Design a protein around this ligand. Sequence first.
Ligand SMILES: NC(=O)C1=CN([C@@H]2O[C@H](COP(=O)(O)OP(=O)(O)OC[C@H]3O[C@@H](n4cnc5c(N)ncnc54)[C@H](OP(=O)(O)O)[C@@H]3O)[C@@H](O)[C@H]2O)C=CC1
Lengths: 48, 49, 64
Amino acid sequence: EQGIELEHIDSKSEFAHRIMLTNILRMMGCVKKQKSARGIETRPAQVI
Amino acid sequence: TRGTGLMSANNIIAEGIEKMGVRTFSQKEMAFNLLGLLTPEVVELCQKS
Amino acid sequence: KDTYGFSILDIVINNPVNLTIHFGGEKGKRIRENYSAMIFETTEKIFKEINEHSTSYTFRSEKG
Ligand SMILES: NC(=O)C1=CN([C@@H]2O[C@H](COP(=O)(O)OP(=O)(O)OC[C@H]3O[C@@H](n4cnc5c(N)ncnc54)[C@H](OP(=O)(O)O)[C@@H]3O)[C@@H](O)[C@H]2O)C=CC1
């Protein structure tokens, strides 16, 4: 996001915030749900 | 980090920044630092908290 | 499940060919300890590969 100040935050900024925050939270949740549905409590995934 | 992605375009001032005793990293260096977090001891440390 | 990290019912029902036990986290470390404490005094340790750096162990077979 280049040259997008506060007054310019628009569709593209929302899509980037989705990518970089909300879908990373969703991917973490998906991994959790997959390991819980299989009873995996002793092989945690490290999130960098 | 100097190189591409988002931090490129700033490579011409990296030397000026480093003149203040700061360190800028190449992508290999930053990758080495990040892979340092996947070492067995850091993994256990993350499992603790 | 609490002591050795596997369910006997799962083995009886599905007959897996291989089973890996993972030692991540506190619970995993406790299970690893239970695995390491086993001996065959006659004092050889059973599971001689398991040590304080093992992250997992794998029971293996051919048919089940
Ligand atoms: N100095 C730095 O570089 C710093 C970086 N960071 C962060 O660390 C991370 C390092 O990445 P970096 O290489 O620097 O940044 P880049 O922007 O180069 O990396 C992002 C990459 O993600 C891929 N991508 C883009 N959009 C999507 C999408 N919608 N879906 C899937 N993949 C996509 C692209 O590669 P492709 O199209 O080939 O898949 C792109 O090259 C970034 O998240 C950055 O914000 C933080 C602080 C400083």
